[PDB]
Amino acid sequence: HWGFGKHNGPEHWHKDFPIAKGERQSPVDIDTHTAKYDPSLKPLSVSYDQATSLRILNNGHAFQVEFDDSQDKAVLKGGPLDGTYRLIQFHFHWGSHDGQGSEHTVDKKKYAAELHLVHWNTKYGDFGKAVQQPDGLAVLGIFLKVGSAKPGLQKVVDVLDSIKTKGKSADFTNFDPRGLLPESLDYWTYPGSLTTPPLLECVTWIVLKEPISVSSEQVSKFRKLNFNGEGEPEEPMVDNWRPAQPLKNRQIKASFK
């Protein structure tokens, strides 16, 4: 029942998901002057060489690329994390125009879109068990801003026409998510939550300081997706981002100065 409409959007989610008003909700605004640089925080370790993509799906609020998470070398570790996290999927959030769309903000600045690479902690055996624990998931977030085209994104954007409506899926093998990473792995990190229902507080967030550049045409293809199923009345898929939530009693740390 939840969505991004006026009557079922993020302001309403707390009615079915009371955790929406909890102590560790995401996304948040990152205040770059108050983020505390921790020089002990280690480098991220992103090993995607063996990442095995499967399919891409329009799920009615976004599109999602799924991975074979039995590949045990397809791993996020290091940085702020204990143990190993397996890549399961990635997806984006975007706006009705270039001037908004990201979920995290930086000094209140909104980016055109935000990529989320979602990984689960192998110590919990599978994703469903993981989301019930405070250290169950690690999500790597990457801002997109408009400029030069990102070559590694092109296979994703070109396939969207074939999954315009809810439920539509397409084989999506041999996609390398390394083509979506910026040069720098400098990041901010904090404990938070899923940003769609069920909004479980099970995520170590790792948000990269450096945005990737994508072309105007590239992000505009995102907005040609539709929330609706085929036959139903066209509802373009835009503004599928949850806004900043109260920081409450948490500290955002930075891996850099």
Active centre residues (catalytic): 61
What's the distance, CA 147 to chain centroid?
20
Q: Considering the complex, what minimum distance in angstroms separates the CB of residue 221 from Cl ion?
A: 6
Q: CA–CA distance from 159 to each of 56, 142, 214 (Å)?
A: 8, 21, 16
d(CA 247, CA 214) in angstroms, rounded, equals 29
In the bound state with Zn ion, the residue whose beta carbon lies nearer, of 116 and 119, is: 116
In the bound state with Cl ion, the residue whose beta carbon lies nearer, of 104 and 150, is: 150
E strand spans, 1-61: 29-30, 36-37, 44-47, 53-58
Q: Considering the complex, what minimum distance in angstroms separates the CB of residue 233 from Zn ion?
A: 26
Q: Is 93 annotated as a binding residue?
A: yes
Interface with Cl ion by CB under 5 A: which residues? 217-218
d(CA 152, CA 238) in angstroms, rounded, equals 22
Q: Is 33 annotated as a binding residue?
A: no
φ/ψ (deg, to 5) at 233: -85, 130
Q: Is 12 annotated as a binding residue?
A: no
In the bound state with Cl ion, the residue whose beta carbon lies nearer, of 131 and 214, is: 214
Out of Cl ion, Zn ion, none, what residue 72 binds, judged by CB under 5 to 8 A for its kind, is: none
Out of Zn ion, Cl ion, none, what residue 218 binds, judged by CB under 5 to 8 A for its kind, is: Cl ion
d(CA 152, CA 181) in angstroms, rounded, equals 9
Q: Considering the complex, what minimum distance in angstroms separates the CB of residue 76 from Zn ion?
A: 15
User: What's the burial of 5, exposed, middle or buried (CB within 10 Å: 0-12/13-18/19+)?
Assistant: exposed
Contact 92, 156 (CB under 8 A): no
Q: Is 116 annotated as a binding residue?
A: yes
Residue 255's closest CA among 219, 216, 206?
A: 206
Q: Considering the complex, what minimum distance in angstroms separates the CB of residue 9 from Cl ion?
A: 28
Interface with Zn ion by CB under 5 A: which residues? 116
Partner residues linked to 214 by β-bridges: 146
Out of Cl ion, Zn ion, none, what residue 217 binds, judged by CB under 5 to 8 A for its kind, is: Cl ion
Q: Considering the complex, what minimum distance in angstroms separates the CB of residue 147 from Cl ion?
A: 13
In the bound state with Zn ion, the residue whose beta carbon lies nearer, of 116 and 209, is: 116
Q: Which residue, chain included where needed, has tokens 């079922």?
A: 8
Contact 233, 164 (CB under 8 A): no
Out of Zn ion, Cl ion, none, what residue 116 binds, judged by CB under 5 to 8 A for its kind, is: Zn ion
Q: Is 196 annotated as a binding residue?
A: yes
In the bound state with Zn ion, the residue whose beta carbon lies nearer, of 140 and 185, is: 140
Residue nearest to Cl ion (CB): 217
* Type of residue at 33: H
Q: Residues annotated in the binding site for substrate, as ranges?
A: 195-196
Residues of each annotated binding site for Zn(2+): 91, 93, 116
Bind-site residues: 91, 93, 116, 195-196
